[PDB]
């Protein structure tokens, strides 16, 4: 009984620098009108690049022969990677068995 809820929803995909993404495994976005950034809770601000302006054929879904519980989320609207006290993070990046 698969059902498309909307697909109308637009989502953006983020490639996030790895340590923060792993930690996630809240902020506030300021959009500058074609340059945009994130004001974090404390901390850094970040710029996010418009990575791919046109993203089509790419949609997001969820789950709940074996058919299973199925629903659609929405469309990938735009592709984005995050860009980045930034001195400390750069130094940690530089630092990067028995």
Which residues in this chain contact other proteins in the complex, by CB under 8 A? 2-4, 7, 9-18, 21-22, 24-33, 38-39, 54, 56-68, 70, 72-77, 80, 93, 96-98
In the complex, minimum distance from the CB of residue 6 to other proteins, in angstroms, rounded to a whole number: 10
> At its nearest, how many Å lie between other proteins and the CB of residue 4?
5
State in angstroms the smallest separation of the CB of 86 from other proteins. 13
CB 65 within 8 A of CB 24: no
The residue among 42 and 65 lying less far from other proteins, judged by its C-beta, is 65
Residue 73: closest CA among 3, 2, 6, 1: 6
Class of residue 48 by CB neighbours under 10 A (exposed 0-12, middle 13-18, buried 19+)? buried
């Amino acid at each position: 009984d698969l059902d498309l809820e909307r697909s109308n929803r637009q989502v953006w995909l983020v490639r996030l620098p790895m340590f923060l993404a792993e930690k996630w495994r809240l902020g506030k976005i300021r959009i500058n009108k074609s340059k945009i950034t994130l004001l974090l809770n404390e901390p850094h601000e970040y710029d996010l690049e418009l990575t791919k302006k046109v993203v089509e054929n790419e949609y997001v879904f969820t789950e709940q022969t074996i058919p299973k519980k199925t629903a659609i989320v929405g469309t990938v609207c735009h592709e984005c990677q995050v860009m980045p006290y930034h001195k400390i993070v750069e130094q940690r990046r530089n630092i990067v068995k028995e």
